[PDB]
Amino acid sequence: GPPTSDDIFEREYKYGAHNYHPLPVALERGKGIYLWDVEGRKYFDFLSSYSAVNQGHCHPKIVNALKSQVDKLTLTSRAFYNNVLGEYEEYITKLFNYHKVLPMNTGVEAGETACKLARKWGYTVKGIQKYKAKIVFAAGNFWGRTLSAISSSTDPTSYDGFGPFMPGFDIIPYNDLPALERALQDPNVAAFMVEPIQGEAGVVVPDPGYLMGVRELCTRHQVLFIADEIQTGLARTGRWLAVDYENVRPDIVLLGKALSGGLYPVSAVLCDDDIMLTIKPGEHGSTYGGNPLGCRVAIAALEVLEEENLAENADKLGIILRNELMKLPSDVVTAVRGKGLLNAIVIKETKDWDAWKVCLRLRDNGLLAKPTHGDIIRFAPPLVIKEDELRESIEIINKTILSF
Amino acid sequence: GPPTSDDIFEREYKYGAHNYHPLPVALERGKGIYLWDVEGRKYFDFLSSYSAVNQGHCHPKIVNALKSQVDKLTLTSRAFYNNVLGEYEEYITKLFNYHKVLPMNTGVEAGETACKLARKWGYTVKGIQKYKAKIVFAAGNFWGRTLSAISSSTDPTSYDGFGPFMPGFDIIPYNDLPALERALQDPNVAAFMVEPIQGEAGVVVPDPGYLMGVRELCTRHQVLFIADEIQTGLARTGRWLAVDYENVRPDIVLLGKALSGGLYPVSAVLCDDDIMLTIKPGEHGSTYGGNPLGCRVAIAALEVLEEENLAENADKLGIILRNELMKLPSDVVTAVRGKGLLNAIVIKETKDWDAWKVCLRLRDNGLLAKPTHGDIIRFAPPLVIKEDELRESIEIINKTILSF
Ligand SMILES: *[C@H](NC1=C[C@@H](C(=O)O)C[C@@H]1F)c1c(COP(=O)(O)O)cnc(C)c1O
Ligand SMILES: *[C@H](NC1=C[C@@H](C(=O)O)C[C@@H]1F)c1c(COP(=O)(O)O)cnc(C)c1O
Structure with missing residues (x-):
């Protein structure tokens, strides 16, 4: 059989340099806003490879x-x-x-x-x-x-x-x-x-x-x-x-x-x-x-x-995204910032809780993001996202944040 | 009509940085050991993009x-x-x-x-x-x-x-x-x-x-x-x-x-x-x-x-290439060196004559190389070259050197 996620992690650990600690997810296909791991699970890409796939995957x-x-x-x-x-x-x-x-x-x-x-x-x-x-x-x-x-x-x-x-x-x-x-x-x-x-x-x-x-x-x-x-x-x-x-x-x-x-x-x-x-x-x-x-x-x-017209889409959908993100409670999300479709939220990092655990749960719920400091989570989906897709992903984010 | 070689040069001159002075040749296709310019002319590639296409083009x-x-x-x-x-x-x-x-x-x-x-x-x-x-x-x-x-x-x-x-x-x-x-x-x-x-x-x-x-x-x-x-x-x-x-x-x-x-x-x-x-x-x-x-x-x-088995081919054909290159006269080619298919000759640079003019004439005769100092010409064809192809290219090199 082909390698599982854990096989992929272990193999990279043995044969590759340890200059990264990635989010434990082993992706296989990307198309538009979506990524699939080796088990078949489907995710929204809310990192866009640090904006390298603004146009969506492939x-x-x-x-x-x-x-x-x-x-x-x-x-x-x-x-x-x-x-x-x-x-x-x-x-x-x-x-x-x-x-x-x-x-x-x-x-x-x-x-x-x-x-x-x-x-x-x-x-x-x-x-x-x-x-x-x-x-x-x-x-x-x-x-x-x-x-x-x-x-x-x-x-x-x-x-x-x-x-x-x-x-x-x-x-x-x-x-x-x-x-x-x-x-x-x-x-x-x-x-x-x-x-x-x-x-x-x-x-x-x-x-x-x-x-x-x-x-x-x-x-x-x-x-x-x-x-x-x-x-x-x-x-x-x-x-x-x-x-x-x-x-x-x-x-x-x-x-x-x-x-x-x-x-x-x-x-x-x-x-x-x-x-x-x-x-x-x-x-x-x-x-x-x-x-x-x-x-x-x-x-x-x-x-x-x-x-x-991806710049205009980025403008309007980023307005929507930040407006929705600001409805999360102040006790958990202390800040929302960004322009267009480059955005981030700041986590009220306890030690019961932090940005890494949030991104793990988001992966569990079908959305991929990665923290950049431990209270900062970046939200940056490909600019080909449509409003209904964005609103479903926002639903995922709400479900995840209010899971804690 | 599609741009000629000179159109290509002029356009790069106007819109691109001047950090290179390339050999005036405007290539379009590469396959194996060969390159074709926009006029249709065919050449042996004896630079291999500084060994990046050891396997031949495409x-x-x-x-x-x-x-x-x-x-x-x-x-x-x-x-x-x-x-x-x-x-x-x-x-x-x-x-x-x-x-x-x-x-x-x-x-x-x-x-x-x-x-x-x-x-x-x-x-x-x-x-x-x-x-x-x-x-x-x-x-x-x-x-x-x-x-x-x-x-x-x-x-x-x-x-x-x-x-x-x-x-x-x-x-x-x-x-x-x-x-x-x-x-x-x-x-x-x-x-x-x-x-x-x-x-x-x-x-x-x-x-x-x-x-x-x-x-x-x-x-x-x-x-x-x-x-x-x-x-x-x-x-x-x-x-x-x-x-x-x-x-x-x-x-x-x-x-x-x-x-x-x-x-x-x-x-x-x-x-x-x-x-x-x-x-x-x-x-x-x-x-x-x-x-x-x-x-x-x-x-x-x-x-x-x-x-x-491209390393063995490189070994044997480089032996052939250096042996043939050393038959050019000492009055014009003062040195032949290299290993495998990475080789170079040194030009008795006059001012009647130099490595750039030699590479221009080689282009004229169907072989592409570029000097690296003004008396040094690199010879480095893709490792997929066969002996008869190599001997034809050596013929081109002889024709060119003894043209002067
Ligand atoms: C590239 N951005 C960065 C590289 C990423 C990583 O691998 O961790 C994440 C990060 F934000 C970058 C660069 C450098 O470009 P490359 O050499 O990586 O191609 C320069 N400036 C900026 C602003 C960014 O984002
Ligand atoms: C790459 N070799 C060099 C680049 C070329 C050019 O554009 O003029 C010709 C030259 F020989 C190289 C490098 C650097 O690799 P890159 O950053 O260019 O990818 C490092 N070491 C060596 C030995 C070589 O040849």
């Missing part, structure tokens, strides 16, 4: 894009040209109104690329002496697990024990314009990198006007505004970019995770020529960056986001 | 693995389990005889993972004080384009202008056991990372006994031996790992690039428990790392390497 248009391109060509390396890359580049740059895109594979690779662009621009355009350029980050940031990315983290689990750290990364509080204004007095600062809503930190939504203020301060002090929209972009918050809510144009925009609908690791760095062209041929790249297969998949995923 | 078994898995499930994130990952992990760990694998996406991500493992092991097992751990690298190394990876590079084009650098990375000459012995006198050294043959540096093959000496010195001084086999592994040099030529077992083995046959970005970090389990749950990861689609593709690519 969206048939993106699946067909993958299938059509793999029968053909998948990787030439950028030592030669392929056809697909230029088409995808024109598409995405015109969609987001930037001169150019630099293609990479994973989100952290886009972050690293942004850091390199900011430093190169700082030395060659702003005139900072090599190698005094600084980049400012917001406490609570998460942008990956490289040595550089954990060097900007304030989370000890990300950086503790991981050797000496990248210099030139400063940290200020999130949602704090006076602190940014103070940091940007140093002319050696080249950039400020920030998430428009902090995902991994617990869906931390900054105050209205924060993004506008960030843009104003960055412009005033000749500092690049890098917006990490790898989790908040591509309709998840109800707009193409979360920064669109304040009509703010960052200098560099990072995209990832739903850029492919979960079918391929595709990431993008968007900016104008006076920043992008600071990097000359041979000075940056990636083996799989810009390969034809991922490019086809990304064109298809962006087209799915546009043609199915 | 190998039907790996294509079918991709197609079968994408109709199903592609990404749950590691917040939950999927079935495929444990199966792939058991497979690859038993294949290479290590306790465990840590899955990532790109080669540089495997390198970063290795660095984190080495530091965490240095502090928690070797007892180095935080954060004094050092990692030693070999001059000429290339392992990616993150800030940490360019911090260990001796190539100014990789690091110049890219902000202050990661501390704790020391550099010694390649192919130099006395220099390694000298570096390892510092008890704060946690690891030595090295390529068994330096690919990007120009297929630099170290002297016989170098890998044995590295292993002996690392063991003697309680230092981890990290072997980057992302380009040299998976049959390319004629063995499963290039280190197999000296029956050397590194502490950490990095795999990438052919791990997927070019169909998906899949990388792996292999090592035993006493190293791997220094990283605890929540302390490292990746969104796409270990996803089911890439895992299916990787199982298939490894199976193709094993069942088609």
